[PDB]
Every structure is written in C-alpha cells, then in structure tokens.
Amino acid sequence: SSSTKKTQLQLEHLLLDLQMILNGINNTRMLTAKFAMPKKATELKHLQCLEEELKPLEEVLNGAQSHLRPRDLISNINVIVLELKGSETTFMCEYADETATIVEFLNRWITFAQSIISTLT
Amino acid sequence: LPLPEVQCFVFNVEYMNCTWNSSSEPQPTNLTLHYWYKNSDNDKVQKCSHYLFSEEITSGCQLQKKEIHLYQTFVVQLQDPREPRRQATQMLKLQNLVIPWAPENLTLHKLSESQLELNWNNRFLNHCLEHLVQYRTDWDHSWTEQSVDYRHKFSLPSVDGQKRYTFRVRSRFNPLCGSAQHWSEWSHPIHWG
Amino acid sequence: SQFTCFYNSRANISCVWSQDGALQDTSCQVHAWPDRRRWNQTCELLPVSQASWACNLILGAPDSQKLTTVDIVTLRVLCREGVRWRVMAIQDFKPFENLRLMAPISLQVVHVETHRCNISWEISQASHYFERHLEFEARTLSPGHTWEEAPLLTLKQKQEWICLETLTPDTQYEFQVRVKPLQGEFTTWSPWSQPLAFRTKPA
Ligand SMILES: *[C@@H]1O[C@H](CO[C@@H]2O[C@@H](C)[C@@H](O)[C@@H](O)[C@@H]2O)[C@@H](O[C@@H]2O[C@H](CO)[C@@H](O)[C@H](O)[C@H]2NC(C)=O)[C@H](O)[C@H]1NC(C)=O
Ligand SMILES: *[C@@H]1O[C@H](CO[C@H]2O[C@@H](C)[C@@H](O)[C@@H](O)[C@@H]2O)[C@@H](O[C@@H]2O[C@H](CO)[C@@H](O)[C@H](O)[C@H]2NC(C)=O)[C@H](O)[C@H]1NC(C)=O
Ligand SMILES: *[C@@H]1O[C@H](CO)[C@@H](O[C@@H]2O[C@H](CO)[C@@H](O)[C@H](O)[C@H]2NC(C)=O)[C@H](O)[C@H]1NC(C)=O
Ligand SMILES: *[C@@H]1O[C@H](CO[C@@H]2O[C@@H](C)[C@@H](O)[C@@H](O)[C@@H]2O)[C@@H](O)[C@H](O)[C@H]1NC(C)=O
Ligand SMILES: *[C@@H]1O[C@H](CO)[C@@H](O)[C@H](O)[C@H]1NC(C)=O
Ligand SMILES: *[C@@H]1O[C@H](CO)[C@@H](O)[C@H](O)[C@H]1NC(C)=O
Ligand SMILES: *[C@H]1O[C@H](CO)[C@@H](O)[C@H](O)[C@@H]1O
User: Which residues does the UniProt record annotate as the domain Fibronectin type-III (chain B)?
Assistant: First the structure.
C-alpha cells in the first residue's frame, strides 16, 4: 500500500541522516569511540539497537565539533527510528559480542536501511 | 606467501564475477575459490562451480542469482590447492559492488518547440539507481553533464532548433539501496534535429 | 473559510487564516503543539489582505532541522473572546506533506554571449532529507512582453543553472526561478526569486 511507501520514505530520511554523519566524519578521538553493534539487523524491530546507541552517538559528535548540529540531528533520528521500529516488545534486538568504531557502526545501519528500502521497491 | 587480490562485481543483480590475476605466482597455478556468507543459513562453505580462465589458468569465479545475497556479508577465500595453509580471505559488501547495465530505450519528446524531455529505461528496480546525463550540440567542443535521481527523466528547457543535439546516460546503484561507486557503461546515444 | 500553512523544510512554518464572514477584531494566534517534541510555539496573527491573517512560527535558527517526516503538529487558531481563548480552527499538520521552500537566491550571470546566457542560482534553507528530489521552473522577461506572457521553462531535476538559447543581441532581459521538492501531497512552488537583470552582448 502507501503505508509501505510511507515506511520507505522514513527509511530514506533515516539513511540520509546517517549518510550525512558519515560524510561529515570523512572530512581522531572520534575514531576510538566504540559502539554496540546488532547481532542481526534484517527487520524494523532491530532498530532498537540503533535507538539505544543514540546517546553515545550524540556524545561523540558533540566532542568532535570545531558542520553538524547534533542535538537536532539525534533527536530527528530518534523520532524516525521510534516510528519505524514498531511497538516495543521484549527481545527486540540482540547485540554482537564485540563493539566497533563509529564508521563500522554507521555503515552497518546504512546497510540495514538500504536492505529494507530495496525490498519495498 | 601473499595471494592475489580478489575483486567481485555484481552485474545488474543477475550474476557476480569475481576475478583475480595470478601471474604474480612463481609458476602457473590453478587457485581455487570458496565462499560463504556471515551470520546466516549460508554458513556452509561453497566451492566455485563455474571457474573463469585466463591463459588456461583459473582467474575468476561466476556466481548465479540464487547464490547472491546483496545485504549479507560475503566472504571469499582464495587457496593454493597444492598448499592448504596458504590462503587469503576477504569480506565484501556486495551492495557497494553492483554495476547496472546501461540504460536503454532513450526517447525524446517535446514539451514545447524549444523544450525537450529525455526518458529512458533500466532493467532494474528504478528506485535503486541514480543517473548521469550528458548532452552536446554540433556547436559544442565537449559534453555538458548533469546528475539525475531515480526519477530518470531529464529536461532541457531551452533548445535551439538550428542545432543538432546528442544525448547519453549512465547509471549507478547509489544511494538508497547501496553505495556503489562505479557507473554503468554509457547508453547508446540518441540524436535530435 | 480556510486555514493554510506551509513548512520551509527547516525551522519556519508560515500560516494564513482567511475568514468568510464576520471579521475578528480581537487578538488571534496560531498555536503549534507537536505530538513528539518538548516545545510548543505561537505567533500573533496580523492582517495581510482584505480578509486574511498571517504569521510565522520560527522553531529555531534559519538552517536548523526542527521537524521530520514523522512529526505531526496540531496547529490551532486561538482568538480572544473576553478573557478566554477560543479555538477557531484546527489541523493535524504533517510538515513534509505541506512544503513550500524559500525562493532560490544568489542568482548570477555565469557567462553571457550575443544569443546565449548561462545563469546559476542556489537554494536556501533546504533540508538534506530531499537529497536531489527537487525540480525548478524558470522564466525570462523580454522587451515586448510581461511576466505573465513569459513561458515557464521546466527543469525536472536538481539543476541549478540554465543556458538560455536563441536570444537577441544587445537586448535587456530579466530572469526568475522557483523551486519545489517532489515530496508531499500539498507541497507547492516556492515564490519566484528576485529577478536578475542582464544584457546580451552586442556582436
Ligand atoms: C519565515 O517564512 C516567512 C514566510 O515566507 C513564506 O512562507 C515560507 C514557508 C516559505 O515558503 C517562503 O518562501 C514564503 O515566502 C517569511 O516571511 C516573509 O518574508 C518576505 C521577505 O522578507 C516578506 O515579503 C513577506 O511579507 C513575509 N511573509 C510573512 C507572512 O511574514 C520569513 O522571513 C521567514 N523567516 C525565516 C527566518 O525563514
Ligand atoms: C502544549 O500545548 C498543549 C495543549 O495546549 C492547550 O491545553 C489547554 C488545557 C490550555 O492550557 C491551552 O491554553 C493550551 O494551549 C498542552 O497540553 C495540556 O497540558 C496539561 C498537562 O500539563 C493537560 O492538563 C492538558 O490536558 C493538555 N491539553 C490537551 C489538549 O491535551 C501541553 O502541556 C503544552 N506543552 C508545552 C511544552 O507547553
Ligand atoms: C553553467 O554554469 C555552471 C558554472 O558555475 C556550470 O555548472 C557547473 O559545471 C561544473 C563543470 O563544468 C561543475 O563542476 C559544477 O558543479 C557545476 N555547477 C552547478 C551548480 O551545477 C554549467 O555546466 C554551465 N552550463 C553550461 C551549459 O555550460
Ligand atoms: C588448470 O585447469 C585446467 C582445467 O580445469 C581444471 O581441470 C578440471 C578437470 C579440474 O581439475 C578443475 O578443478 C580444474 O580447474 C587444466 O586444463 C590445466 O592444465 C590446469 N593447469 C594447471 C597449471 O594446473
Ligand atoms: C563475467 O563472466 C562471464 C563468464 O566468463 C561473461 O559471460 C561476462 O561477459 C563476464 N564479464 C562481465 C563484465 O560481465
Ligand atoms: C526496451 O524496449 C523493448 C522493445 O520495445 C522492450 O522489450 C524492453 O523491455 C525495453 N527495455 C527496458 C529495460 O525496459
Ligand atoms: C506550483 O505552480 C503552479 C502555480 O502556482 C500550481 O500548479 C501549483 O501551486 C504548483 O505547486
């Protein structure tokens, strides 16, 4: 339906928020910060794992400022994720056994959104 | 000790060619390719069942559509068949390694006497591509280029009827379904006059 | 009798309230009440035309992203009757369904010839959420004619210049452009940019 297109457009906006952070990063203490990573990320409830890492994401982007507005940006990602994720149950998402750098974190969640976007087309 | 590097490309999500150049080896050698996917049912290590050859030596593998999982991490392993411990592994992200076929069926139509619209098709989910349009006239010493998103139309809002126009288009699997960097081949051009 | 608002895609929602009948003479405001943000905002409605009122809800700095496509903002017109505030109009405002961007800016001549001119422009206060899903329309004022007679030149892509062909030499022209995103059911064109004056070379 067009709730599928609504979902798709929400995923695109999330993706553009993430790509913007990643593009901003690619232009030191930022690259040592470690992020929890989803064990599995194939359906929308797994965004729980992105949601839970938004506070540490915000903190790292605040520390690095010297072309992003992280309070706005994170609060935007937060509401989009909350809408996409669905109603909260137990065992939404499980973490991998190792943490990762910010670039691996962002690329993982970028890959996630891309994977759902392509099935909704 | 150091094996040749494998390079994989998913062509229009129909099949994947993985290739390597093994003339860096001290003799001619048929290296073997195994692959598997991370975090999956496809943990079972697969053997290449369609080798590619270059000077009668293995230089690549072809995987079919069934064996492609664009968003699951792809692990490719080269191995010396006469020396088991000698092996190199890479983790590939296939969604960044897609190359679409060139766009097709370029058509022009008039919005007015001096405004043209270029249209085209891709054999591919329209949404997952962006495009680069190039055009020129018989008065121009070079192509003018302009990028275009999944809409896959291009307006030319001021046309000179005295000039002859040429158009071509290429496409890329970026940025909504993947972050590939390579462009397709150029389409066959079309002309207007 | 109608209540119509548009979002610039960043931090500005502008509202118009048109009455069809008895005209208010007391204070009226627009109140913005977002369903998932910690702030409310208001603006005082001032007359703009014969029966319409307008004001702007400034949510933050000019280029800050204060709303998203999942936000829903209850917009209400509240007018003062005696000491009480009366709700005179209400909508559930979906900001990315009601977009109207700022007019393009920084128009300049890139290169001008005898029969041709390349003109470039920039957009302003435009969300990164659009990526390149924008379009433009332009038009040229000629010596003979009016703006209303000038044909609309269509750009169905994010292209921030135009090369105008088949112009007359040593002739005085003016040029305008406007923009919109392709997203949103009620999305509408920006206003026209300021006209840029230019002159073709003489030959
Ligand atoms: C906030 O927006 C208003 C209104 O601008 C219109 O609505 C917007 C959503 C957008 O679509 C704009 O392109 C529209 O023009 C701005 O107020 C207008 O400013 C112009 C020029 O100064 C003036 O001629 C009009 O009278 C104004 N209209 C009203 C109703 O006040 C205002 O400047 C914007 N402020 C910022 C900081 O963006
Ligand atoms: C943003 O506004 C909403 C709704 O605002 C209206 O609520 C009326 C009761 C009245 O105050 C009117 O002037 C106002 O504009 C606020 O929600 C209200 O808050 C209190 C709880 O604090 C509740 O008792 C009301 O039920 C609730 N109203 C409704 C209609 O739900 C909200 O508090 C306010 N937010 C901020 C940050 O100011
Ligand atoms: C009209 O003007 C601009 C020059 O500023 C041209 O567009 C630029 O083209 C260069 C390469 O030629 C790019 O690197 C810039 O990014 C372009 N800028 C923009 C805003 O698109 C444009 O090609 C000129 N038009 C013609 C027909 O020559
Ligand atoms: C390399 O391989 C060529 C043909 O393929 C091989 O032959 C079949 C029967 C299987 O063994 C398969 O695994 C191989 O890929 C040979 O004709 C050629 O002689 C081989 N060359 C060397 C140097 O080993
Ligand atoms: C990929 O491999 C197959 C088999 O060798 C071949 O048909 C195809 O042309 C190859 N190359 C490309 C660029 O597709
Ligand atoms: C191009 O046109 C042909 C013939 O009319 C058609 O069969 C084919 O599907 C078109 N190609 C694409 C990619 O749509
Ligand atoms: C922009 O332009 C025309 C005239 O204003 C209308 O068809 C419509 O508002 C569109 O969005």
Answer: 102-193
